[model samples]
Target: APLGPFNATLLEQLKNDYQKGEKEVTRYIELQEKVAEKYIKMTPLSVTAKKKLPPSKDPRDYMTLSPYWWPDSTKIDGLPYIRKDGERNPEVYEYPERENANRFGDAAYCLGVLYYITGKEVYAKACANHLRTWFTDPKLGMNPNMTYAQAVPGMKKMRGSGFIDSRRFSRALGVAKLIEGSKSWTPSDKKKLDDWATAFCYWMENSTQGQRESHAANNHGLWYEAIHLMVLAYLDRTDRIREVAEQSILPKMGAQIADDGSLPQELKRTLSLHYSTFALEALMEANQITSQIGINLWSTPASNGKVASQAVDYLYPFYLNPEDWKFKQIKPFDQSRAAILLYEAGTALGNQKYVDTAKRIGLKYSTSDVETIPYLVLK
Candidate 1:
């Protein structure tokens, strides 16, 4: 019941199907095994590992640079940084809290899933270590909010835009379900994971930046709700989950998605294709959690009948041939991860159309079938 972002009944069947040598599941297992192996060798991350102190001067608070905000050559002190669209300042990488936390969360998610599939205690042990380093260890763990996240040099120290940094925890802390029965993940760790996640979620729900982000009319708000729903699910607050779905997420669909299935705001982005797909990822992600609570976002129509599935349909052909895309994408768009969108929609709607479309993209661009496996197994 607690397999976050995935259907538990389907997960059990996927494991059984892998044992039966089901081709898709077999390929998925092989790919997952390699991913888990890579993570197994890596060192766990801690916020204190960073050399820089944020505006708070607290290592426990998460912090990172505002991508694309650069020092103005005209200014002597670079007093106010300027924006360069579609560019990342090299300084951003220097502050790796955002990226490292993302990496740590992903590694934990991968290792957690592999433990479920292989029943390998080693994977659980490694994943539990990852949990402690990033979430629970008093000195090493991160504080529960993003007040200082993605801060710009010349702007307010707290930017609402950076709150998506913790978006992966919705998936990262999903390890709770996988490791529930593992000897390597103890009762104490479970309590810590819950307390930490709830605290972080509570902070985001009430914090100033979070309130500002809640009104974001694009991917940022969608992503914010995605994590909001996941944390609510983890907390088992079905009543709040339902309220957010109807009041928060549903209205977003009406405002964001057009009847033709195109996302209006994302297309205006320089990275149109990427934002379109990413926004869809957030909607589908929210639906995945809410679905478990008997809420239905997949079938719910936006204003003029624009649904999440339609956006998937809108993006499907473009993914097949990025050259055919009409949006403004200055950078070469990576089509590999879009495969997961297809898989996620496929399972939520139980539509073979999306699943087959996903396979087509997988055939065209898959490196190891690693990225799409999480949702593909749901069927």
Candidate 2:
């Protein structure tokens, strides 16, 4: 997987991070049960075979999705869909990509992955169904337009920002990878989806949100390019995909990632842990794309004796529990994936341990931003 220039450890870290997040959320099942009781009275769920309700208070605050999450509107500030400033707003009916789509993707991927690991078709079917709702069915699914994803309510409408709303669809791409060769999938369904993705690529290229995100120089910009390229590739729109990759995409990666591999903007943020991971996730996506395209997102510096390896070197040692990690603010930080990326870089150049840490973080912390306060984490 690191063959694409992303340190293999990076992918391993991301995978471990998600796994950790899932474990953390799994520990919240009891809290979910307790909270469900109180919230059920306020936002009644159906009595059907599968009951769903409005989002409720929990350590994860719907941060970890299961079948139970969808039917309910999003929860904010202890109330569902009410504005943070206390106004009743339909715009609050935001979906996955707004802030926590990655959590949703984790849940769905967990299901699909578990199904894959356990040989259970039910999980696969359920995962596939959710994808359809999000990407295919207009009424049942998300608009496939995250134009207004993180747009501040009242200040911005949900047009192109909706594109931001579906960022975790990156994981949906993972789900599609799992099912693409399976007999359970259908061509017509693929066609419907393929068409949707194609239109989305068009919208991304032409839409205000897409352009805004594309030019976004930080991690957000890199991610937009990744998603834009990912969707276009999925839709078989190779011409545009290559264009973005060669022009806007690759160049942007070199600019944003520092010679020391630190994203300066992220390091300057209060949410350092989150921003670091955020930039890393974007790089992972870029790595995936470059691997698929048979080029290297890191290849600009080329193999052995390259400037790219410095990145793995710069970040990996800190992960191996080295006392030399220069940054500050977070405690008990796990840098195990640094070894993973080092391994990836080494494989690329016949050397090793660009980072030299293990996948010790192994998992993530699962809790909502507000509910978990001092202990916020992600999948």
Candidate 3:
């Protein structure tokens, strides 16, 4: 009965349909092959393999300087860095945590799904190898906390906002659970995955930065909840999962989303559309987990009749007509992922309007990977 961000019943339906020679599953198989093809060429990436470290930083610790903060040329050594909001400092990538986190998320999620759909040992084996390197191997495993993550050069050593960099691991955890029954997953590997997640969850509950992020009123808080939900789901801690969803997640939507279905907090962001989509993704993600517990966020509207689905509908105009956004969006907005989310929301809420929008926009932008497979199959 425990599933990740996906509907197990839907997966079974899709799998059954595939067995009946449904043509859509062919696209699913093609996507799996693309994922495997790319995965086969890679080695396991790890946080401990960084080329540099902050002063007094341990190689085992996850670290990355603030991406938006830069040294002032007027000051020597850039004391008290300044923020050019939305402009990323190239220096953040000099460290390996972000790059490695992204790689792990992408590879683990794709490979995990491949193994699940095909019952292929190779996909599970590749996923397990990456998991061992990043979570279990003493010499390479990352510490369970992000104490120095998103550190500013001249300001603070770390910030709670840095936790955003690794939230995609929520999807990775989803894939991990799917492959938990695979033959390639040994008992030791299972223990390592559980222990690592348990320790990380403990840190998120007790550490200073963890509390800061949990209290964040914006997308940061939602992302924090999503990550914690996925990790708790991975550990099979049902009680804590419910507690986090009700206590941590439910309150966020009530406060952050306006009665008019607008995310006032996200719209204030420089990349308004980007953050809006991100915040909605987090809401949908938490709903996916809470739905297992009989809590449906889509049906629970705010006092003003605003629900998550309405929020998705609110974005349809801008999504279908980007130039009409009429807000500050510093970079080019991409609708590929948002389109898939609409398709997902449409199906989950039984709204054909969103499904039609997704079809009109065309799934052409979707990159035929694990992330896009569910929308493709269900649509």
lDDT of 2 by residue, 57-94 (tens): 21111221211112224444332222222122343343
For candidate 3, lDDT tens digit of each residue in 1-379?
3468665555566566666777777666665667577775679887888768756567888888778888898997777889987799998888878778888888887777667766678889898887778777898888888888888776745578888766756567666887787788988788888888889989988888999999999999998998887878888887887787667776787788876778899898789899889998887777777777776776666554556777787888888888899878999998776676777677778888887887777565346445665555334
Q: Name the candidate that leads on TM-score.
A: 3
- Residue pairs in clash, model 3: none
lDDT of 1 by residue, 281-367 (tens): 888778778877676687787556767887888888887788999979989987766666777678678989888777766642234
State residue 48's C-alpha deviation in candidate 2, in Å: 18
Highest-scoring model, lDDT: 1
Query: lDDT (0-100) at residue 30 of candidate 3?
Result: 63
Could you give me the TM-score of model 3 versus the true structure?
0.92
Superposed model 2: Cα runs more than 4 Å off: 1-104, 110-123, 154-165, 259-261, 302-308, 321-351, 359-379
Error of 1 at 231 (Å): 1.5
For each candidate in turn, give its C-alpha RMSD to the true structure in angstroms: 2.7, 11.2, 2.2
What TM-score would every model get versus the actual structure?
A: 0.90, 0.61, 0.92
Runs of candidate 1 with Cα error greater than 4 angstroms are: 1-3, 7-10, 19-31, 363-370, 375-379
Clash counts for all predictions: 0, 29, 0
Using TM-score as the yardstick, the better of models 1 and 2 is 1
Q: Residue 284, candidate 2: how far off, in angstroms?
A: 1.8
Kindly state the number of residue pairs that clash in model 3.
0
